[PDB]
């Protein structure tokens, strides 16, 4: 049943990653580039934490273990995957703001 | 299914309707901002938010059902519906960021 | 699991489409608009492959033909939904870069 903690740990870490990435984007918008870079570093860490749980989840099935699929679990997987997506495009927003500061 | 739709099977359709409209409002807003139509963009974002709220109502009921031990039937459509809801939230959140970026680009040139 | 090859195929096509789309963004970022545009055609071709799998998943179920639900399937659907959104917003980024070029 420890495996049934997977959804919670996914949501918690993914939300943390998503939060860091958006914070990074806001810093970049305000011209605080050092703070933006740091937040992204932290976002990368958080997505790593989340991935540990996703990997175990996928390998569990691969391994032949039966997993009771719930809405919560599906929702947890959406959190991680959307977090990865937010982080990837946030990096592009950050990069664009850096480009714009270069010109004045 | 096409032969018979159960009451529970209504949830995915409702989530897709509202989430889809949320995503549509967000993209409409993005497109407005791109044209320098900022007030129309701001208002479409409000409607995006409202549509996510309506979708969210079904979400809470769905999660809580499970909490009660009321096992939901997992289907492709339900998974897809969940994807759409979470997608709408992501699109709205980033479209906000496109809109702000378009406002900044106006502020300069 | 002969139908369980579909998740694998969804993941592969979607992942490649996402990569293609990101390639396009980086090209446009470098001022390489021809390469960007070409990268997006490839993204669209790969999205279509995965999308075709998904339409059949949804339609078959509507017909009463039940699919075996697994973590990998759910994962596969996440890959497509996010690939679609990345492609779509990468296109918005490409437009932003083209915009910045045109003004100078
Ligand atoms: Cl991982
Ligand atoms: Cl190529
Ligand atoms: Mg999903
Ligand atoms: Na960028
Ligand atoms: Na509302
Ligand atoms: Na359930
Ligand atoms: Na922004
Ligand atoms: Na754009």
Automatic annotation (TrEMBL), chains A, C:
CDD domains: PTS_IIA_lac. Keywords: Cytoplasm, Magnesium, Metal-binding, Phosphotransferase system, Sugar transport, Transferase, Transport. GO terms for biological process: phosphoenolpyruvate-dependent sugar phosphotransferase system. InterPro entries: PTS_IIA_lac/cel, PTS_IIA_lac/cel_sf. Binds 1 Mg(2+) ion per trimer. It is found in: Cytoplasm. Its cofactor is Mg(2+). The active site is at 75 (tele-phosphohistidine intermediate). Its main location: cytoplasm. Mg(2+) binds at residue 78. GO terms for cellular component: cytoplasm. The modification Phosphohistidine is found at residue 75. One of its GO terms (molecular function) is metal ion binding. This is PTS system, cellobiose-specific IIA component. It comes from Bacillus anthracis (anthrax bacterium).
Automatic annotation (TrEMBL), chain B:
Its cofactor is Mg(2+). Its EC number is 2.7.1.69. It is an enzyme of class 2 (transferase). The modification Phosphohistidine is found at residue 80. PROSITE patterns: PTS_EIIA_TYPE_3. Binds 1 Mg(2+) ion per trimer. GO terms for cellular component: cytoplasm. One of its GO terms (biological process) is phosphoenolpyruvate-dependent sugar phosphotransferase system. Coiled coil: none annotated. InterPro entries: PTS_IIA_lac/cel (IPR003188), PTS_IIA_lac/cel_sf (IPR036542). Keywords: Cytoplasm, Magnesium, Metal-binding, Phosphotransferase system, Sugar transport, Transferase, Transport. GO terms for molecular function: metal ion binding; transferase activity. Pfam families: PTS_IIA. The active site is at residue 80. It comes from the Bacteria. It is found in: Cytoplasm. Mg(2+) binds at residue 83. This is PTS system, cellobiose-specific IIA component. It comes from Bacillus anthracis (anthrax bacterium).
């Amino acid at each position: 049943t420890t495996a049934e903690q997977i959804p919670f740990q996914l949501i918690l870490n993914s939300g943390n990653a998503r939060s860091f990435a958006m914070e990074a984007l806001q810093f970049a918008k305000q011209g605080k580039m050092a703070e933006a870079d740091e937040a992204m570093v932290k976002a990368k860490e958080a997505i790593n934490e989340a991935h540990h749980f996703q990997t175990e989840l996928i390998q569990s099935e691969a391994r032949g273990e039966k997993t009771e699929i719930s809405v919560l679990l599906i929702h947890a997987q959406d959190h991680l995957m959307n977090a990865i997506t937010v982080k990837e495009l946030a990096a592009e927003f950050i990069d664009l703001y850096k480009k714009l500061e270069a010109k004045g």
